């Protein structure tokens, strides 16, 4: 029957981005990767099988895939090749994804708003907003 993340499931295409270069700078991404990754128009493919959520992000730059159980820490290699420890939880209907590495932390929030999936990425004082629509 219906569950946790049903409204996230599907295939989503990036339609807008704001301040992603600044977010990537704050994270520590170098110039060439910022330029190529910032040009990308990834799709995001979200699926659920039991307790396991899978999020794939695919673009001309890279294809990434994470599978996880809410509240259970895992290893992630990010699109920019960081080796991070991640934990994803659901907080009042928002997927909250925290990445830890090198004594640093960033949080990515994914939420459904109208027909969009809105992604907010925060690294200290810098927020990037990325908006997806159904493919």
Ligand X SMILES: O=S(=O)(Nc1cccc2nsnc12)c1cc(Cl)sc1Cl
Q: Say if residue 132 carries a ligand binding annotation.
A: yes
Query: Using CB under 6 A, which of 108, 117, 123, 132 touches ligand X?
Result: 108
61 sits in the region (left: phi over 0; alpha: psi -120 to 50; else beta) called alpha
Q: 74-77 and 63-68 as β-strands: parallel, antiparallel, unpaired? A: unpaired
Q: Say if residue 34 carries a ligand binding annotation.
A: no
Q: Say if residue 126 carries a ligand binding annotation.
A: no
User: Angle 20-27/31-39 helices, nearest 10 degrees?
Assistant: 150
Query: Using CB under 6 A, which of 4, 5, 9, 40 touches ligand X?
Result: 40
Query: Using CB under 6 A, which of 26, 53, 57, 132 touches ligand X?
Result: 57
CB 89 within 8 A of CB 71: yes
Interface ranges with ligand X (CB under 6 A): 37, 40, 42, 57-59, 61-64, 78-80, 108, 119, 121, 130
């Amino acid at each position: 029957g219906s569950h946790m993340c049903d409204a996230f499931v599907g295939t989503w295409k990036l339609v807008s981005s704001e301040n992603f270069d600044d977010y990537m700078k704050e994270v520590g991404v170098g110039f060439a990767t910022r330029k190529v990754a910032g040009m990308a128009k990834p799709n995001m493919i979200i699926s659920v099988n039991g307790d396991v959520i899978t999020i794939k992000s695919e673009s001309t730059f890279k294809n990434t895939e994470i599978s996880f159980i809410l509240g259970q820490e895992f290893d992630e290699v990010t699109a920019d090749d960081r080796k991070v420890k991640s934990t994803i939880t659901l907080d009042g209907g928002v997927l909250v994804h925290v990445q830890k590495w090198d004594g640093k932390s960033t949080t990515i929030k994914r939420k459904r708003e109208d027909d969009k999936l809105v992604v907010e990425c925060v690294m200290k004082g810098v927020t990037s907003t990325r908006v997806y629509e159904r493919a």
